[PDB]
Amino acid sequence: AINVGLSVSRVGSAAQVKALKQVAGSLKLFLAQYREVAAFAQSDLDASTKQTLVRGERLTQLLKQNQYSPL
Amino acid sequence: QTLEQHDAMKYSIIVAATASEAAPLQYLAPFTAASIGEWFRDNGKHALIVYDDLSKQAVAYRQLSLLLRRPPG
Amino acid sequence: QTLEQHDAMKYSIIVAATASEAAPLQYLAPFTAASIGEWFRDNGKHALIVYDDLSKQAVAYRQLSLLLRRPPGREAYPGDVFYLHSRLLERAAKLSEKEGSGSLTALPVIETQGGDVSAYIPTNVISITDGQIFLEAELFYKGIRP
Amino acid sequence: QGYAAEISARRNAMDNASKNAGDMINRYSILYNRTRQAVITNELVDIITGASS
Amino acid sequence: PITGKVTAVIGAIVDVHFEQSELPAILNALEIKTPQGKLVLEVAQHLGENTVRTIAMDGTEGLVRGEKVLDTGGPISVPVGRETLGRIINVIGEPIDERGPIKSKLRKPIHADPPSFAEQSTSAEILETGIKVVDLLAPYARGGKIGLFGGAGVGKTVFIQELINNIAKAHGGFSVFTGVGERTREGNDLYREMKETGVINLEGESKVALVFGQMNEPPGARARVALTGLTIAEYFRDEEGQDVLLFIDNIFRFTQAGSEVSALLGRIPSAVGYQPTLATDMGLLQERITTTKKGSVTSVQAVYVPADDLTDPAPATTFAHLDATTVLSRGISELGIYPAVDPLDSKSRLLDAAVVGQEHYDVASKVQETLQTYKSLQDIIAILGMDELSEQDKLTVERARKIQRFLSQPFAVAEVFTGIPGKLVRLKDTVASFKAVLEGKYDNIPEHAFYMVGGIEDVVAKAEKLAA
Amino acid sequence: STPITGKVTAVIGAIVDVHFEQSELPAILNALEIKTPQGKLVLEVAQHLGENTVRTIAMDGTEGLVRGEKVLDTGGPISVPVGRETLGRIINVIGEPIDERGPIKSKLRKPIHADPPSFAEQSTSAEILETGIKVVDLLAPYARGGKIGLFGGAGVGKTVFIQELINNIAKAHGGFSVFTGVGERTREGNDLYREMKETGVINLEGESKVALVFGQMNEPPGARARVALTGLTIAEYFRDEEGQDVLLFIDNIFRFTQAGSEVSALLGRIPSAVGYQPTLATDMGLLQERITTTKKGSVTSVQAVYVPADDLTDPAPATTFAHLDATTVLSRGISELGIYPAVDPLDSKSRLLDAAVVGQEHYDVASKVQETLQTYKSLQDIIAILGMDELSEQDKLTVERARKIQRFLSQPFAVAEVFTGIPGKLVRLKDTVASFKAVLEGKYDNIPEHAFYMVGGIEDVVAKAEKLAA
Amino acid sequence: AEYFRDEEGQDVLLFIDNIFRFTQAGSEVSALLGRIPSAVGYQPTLATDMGLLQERITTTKKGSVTSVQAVYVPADDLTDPAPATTFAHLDATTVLSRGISELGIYPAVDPLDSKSRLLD
């Protein structure tokens, strides 16, 4: 239930090895791209914002997990 | 119990300083726990400590501080 | 150095108490500045004395009082701060035409950190003075500089 | 046709405004409460330092 | 025991100086002989030199420095048992109600140490009632703290009475209603009302025992009444293995009185104008409330907000301890639904998949979801009009309205007013009903024909009777 | 035996402690005098701390008080002079002339303290003050007996308000007056002293129509406190023994409250109400009861009051609001708008306003005014957002009369010839009642807003209708 | 700093992270010391002590010590005495609030809360 919009990591940021480098080189920056598009959607009517919007919505749904069952 | 159902209690330490318990016990609660954690640390071994919740420790210490006439914030 | 460039030093006197220098000397600087002004007044000449800032004199007098054990008042300032400000400001008088009509003019200044007018010190000064020349932060932005 | 759209439009806009102002009433209410609580504590402490000295 | 002479009387803070050997231990109860009854003073510091500092429980008037004092040997001892029920007792354990000395076979101290780690609520437990709304959407638990909300005299009394009634059937248990900040005019009315609705009987035993802490008695007598009722509950739990339900009134006036106790003893009352030993006192109070192996005390407590704030220190300290909140409101009562419970504001942290089994949680989520979706739809459905309803949308409307009516209990406590025979609907039987309504197997049964009935069995009757 | 010797023990600002000798037996409210180069420093005993040692407040300078220097015991409170020959002279807080014309003449003297008159002495009002200012006269008039209070912030023309009332009312009435200046600037004293000397309210021969008592703020906090008790005593003398109404005036009475607050902390009395003396209610209470109508004289005070931070929901003004009969509220905004005075129309309230006391017509007219303005203020919101043409025709007309009324509060003064430069007006009570009524009845909505701007009485309103047309 | 300024004749530079710590530790020792804590909780000897440290790294004729001083804002209140007496010894500011840092704006300088006397 963590906002990455309010979270930050300074000189504590490291735990990203190659696997977690390739697949996205930090999913948090992209999910602070979602914050913008969804800021002014409720941005563009252009396919670029709508593609991010569509990704951001799918991603937020995908996070949802059950309590005391980790992966 | 939760930990003992899921098979994991034996690699964890639990420290308790409840709310019925006296104001110095709560104060000293985090500093002591970290002493056990440092012993694991300084054997070059990796460890973890969760201090839940330090704000209630701040309260436990507040009564002591107020009686010791140390400034309020 | 700005005054000496614009040739405003040949009538100006500068009285100073910098931050590093002690709290006694900090209290004492407006009151010793008053006297230099009063001499002009007495002789039938004119002067104008800027007392910037008196809010920091109150802090000087606060340090002074609390380590001589005078009980804190409203917001830690001692219960006689107003008495200081009153006795200083009124030596900006005009005199009768026997004495030559000399008058000390005063401009006190209150540099306020939050801009609260419900603080003890800003109130205290407003009563004493005959007029107010409110300057605001917002109006600085808006393009009136100063 | 224009006048009908206009009177329909103002209903829609002004509804969305009732909600927008509401979201802001609730946000200034949270500040209002926090703000009163700090004043009470800061008032108290002044008495305490005085009694004590 | 040892004897000594009163050597101060400042405020309601009386210091007593004793002949030299030792002083009373801390928390002990001292008895003062005077022509003002007795005054029981409780030690809350040792000043040293065989002197004490005490708080008062009885008004401080008709004292003189030089009156002889007696040390009991420990806390104030309140009577316990099943010969104390239906009778009102003040902080010293003696009648206000004037029905003749309240005495029983055993007495026990008001201050006690909380049970061991081993003997606390360590696994989940479920405390079954008769109300459908509580048992589905916020399950009462054993050793559970449920903080009641809303005002007094709109349903509040009816709600308290109901649960006392349910407990006797369920276990054979007892309750003790503890009133802190109690007004004496109101107290007579609650005892007379409690008689009428059948939970206090004028002949022998009863159910609930009443503990009142008047405001015309010092702050300590408001503070220690909560402890006074607890001792009674525990006696049933420990030595007769019976489950109990312990009410508290307003928790603002427990807080209000404790501030005075702090400020007076020497201590500073700083905690936004309240005591700094507040958290630690709730910690003592609500950690003797728990499920032991023989029985369990459960507590219902009442939250009073200071000025409509949930961000204040006193609401905040309470909200951490509390595991569920039940929210009575008036809107509900005006639609003819008694309990006054809000199923939108009925929540527990003991409403989970693994605490009440999977089925219970998953039906509760749907029941919550229908009502939530019905509300969102209803905003624009009223404005647009009731005919700009979708086929899809009116399916949500229909289900919700069936659920809304079905909740109501024509229960025994409010029986007189509607005229309809009482109901107790057990927790298992609540869950079961909700399963058939979810699959729409009663979408042949009209919406309004779910009116004033309980379980699945009950609404078979109303359906026939509406048609007839 | 009473020692006539004390030796000073601690000078800590205004607080001066004395060490009296064997047998003295100190008593509170006495006066100690210390010989000094600045005269005789008067000390009013406000505690005994035990064993012949007082803790006192100074009324004169302590920047030259020498320790070890002999302190006589005088006893009781100091005694000022009263009479009718005490008029139009400037009297100091210690009772001494700073107008420098030999001593302030006497017959009898009384002390600056006086016990407050009992219930049996009290009697009601029956006379109605008329100030000649149209807003005060319609929406809240004052009556003799009253404890009037001029609440406002700073910049709302506090001195000027107080000045106006002396220019009119003072000449008019048959009684003498007392002007008391509590803690005020050296400019303001001199402004009052020149302006009224010329106007003949101050005269070098006695038996005037004002008294002057100037106590100033460059004197210690105790003096500012007991300048007020001094002037008041002149008024009690009028009232009882010499049987004459007084139209007392005091200025600024916040300097009296603020003064008590300063010496309160230092005397040990920890602040209460947040930064104020814990003895706020009783000090006020004692002060206010002396100023009243009894079996003889009627002493009707006009008191200036300063609201700090322009906020009047703060505890120091609010306590006072209770203590004063006939409040007015003034504000920065109204003064700047060109509406003289800055008195607000709905916030000027009396507890001496009855429908029979001021007569039924008057009452009904002032109520209509209170309604029309209140509709105007409710409508301000609608007009901001919705616009002015989405108002009903009844509403639109109320806006229009309310604007006429709003500019019908504006009257220039002689003592506000430092603002407009147009002399003052005198407006009779009946003339206010009749001209406001006419607007409201809809028969006098032919008159524009600017012809009610800058007018006197009725005659004036008619005269201004013609002038603008040409 | 003084060693570089004077003796070695150099113009210096200076960075500090955080001078709030100086102010705050001194507030802790002040009760014990024999001193009455002033408004908020801060020490009464505050102005004199802070002045001396910032005049020990001053613009001398042997070396000009350009300072960047960071005061961590206490409890999101910048009007309090520890950050406020800092402005006294300053000619320029670049005031930073957390809100503008979080939205994705680095450096977090408020543009509506900056002033300078090094701008003309």
Curated annotation (Swiss-Prot), chain B:
Superkingdom of source: Eukaryota
Family of the protein in this entry: Belongs to the ATPase alpha/beta chains family.
Name the UniProt record assigns to this protein: ATP synthase subunit alpha, mitochondrial
Record's subcellular location: Mitochondrion inner membrane
Location of this fragment in the whole protein: 255 to 327 of 545
UniProt function note: Mitochondrial membrane ATP synthase (F(1)F(0) ATP synthase or Complex V) produces ATP from ADP in the presence of a proton gradient across the membrane which is generated by electron transport complexes of the respiratory chain. F-type ATPases consist of two structural domains, F(1) - containing the extramembraneous catalytic core, and F(0) - containing the membrane proton channel, linked together by a central stalk and a peripheral stalk. During catalysis, ATP synthesis in the catalytic domain of F(1) is coupled via a rotary mechanism of the central stalk subunits to proton translocation.
Anything else known: Present with 41500 molecules/cell in log phase SD medium.
Subunit structure comment from the entry: F-type ATPases have 2 components, CF(1) - the catalytic core - and CF(0) - the membrane proton channel. CF(1) has five subunits: alpha(3), beta(3), gamma(1), delta(1), epsilon(1). CF(0) has three main subunits: a, b and c.
Disulfide pairings: none
Stated consequence of mutating residue 37 to D: In ATP1-2; growth-defect
Curated annotation (Swiss-Prot), chain D:
Effect of mutating residue 52 to F: In allele ATP3a
Domain of life: Eukaryota
Intracellular or extracellular location(s): Mitochondrion; Mitochondrion inner membrane
Subunit annotation: F-type ATPases have 2 components, CF(1) - the catalytic core - and CF(0) - the membrane proton channel. CF(1) has five subunits: alpha(3), beta(3), gamma(1), delta(1), epsilon(1). CF(0) has three main subunits: a, b and c.
Anything else known: Present with 28100 molecules/cell in log phase SD medium.
Sequence similarity: Belongs to the ATPase gamma chain family.
Role noted for this protein: Mitochondrial membrane ATP synthase (F(1)F(0) ATP synthase or Complex V) produces ATP from ADP in the presence of a proton gradient across the membrane which is generated by electron transport complexes of the respiratory chain. F-type ATPases consist of two structural domains, F(1) - containing the extramembraneous catalytic core, and F(0) - containing the membrane proton channel, linked together by a central stalk and a peripheral stalk. During catalysis, ATP synthesis in the catalytic domain of F(1) is coupled via a rotary mechanism of the central stalk subunits to proton translocation.
Protein name per UniProt: ATP synthase subunit gamma, mitochondrial
Gene for this chain: ATP3
Full-protein interval shown: 257 to 309 of 311
UniProtKB/Swiss-Prot annotation, chain G:
Domain of life of the source: Eukaryota
Purpose: Mitochondrial membrane ATP synthase (F(1)F(0) ATP synthase or Complex V) produces ATP from ADP in the presence of a proton gradient across the membrane which is generated by electron transport complexes of the respiratory chain. F-type ATPases consist of two structural domains, F(1) - containing the extramembraneous catalytic core, and F(0) - containing the membrane proton channel, linked together by a central stalk and a peripheral stalk. During catalysis, ATP synthesis in the catalytic domain of F(1) is coupled via a rotary mechanism of the central stalk subunits to proton translocation.
Oligomer status and interactors: F-type ATPases have 2 components, CF(1) - the catalytic core - and CF(0) - the membrane proton channel. CF(1) has five subunits: alpha(3), beta(3), gamma(1), delta(1), epsilon(1). CF(0) has three main subunits: a, b and c.
UniProt record similarity statement: Belongs to the ATPase alpha/beta chains family.
Record organism: Saccharomyces cerevisiae (strain ATCC 204508 / S288c) (Baker's yeast)
Interval of the full protein contained in this chain: 273 to 392 of 511
Modified residues (Phosphoserine): 101
Remarks, miscellaneous: Present with 164000 molecules/cell in log phase SD medium.
Protein name: ATP synthase subunit beta, mitochondrial
Cellular compartment(s): Mitochondrion; Mitochondrion inner membrane
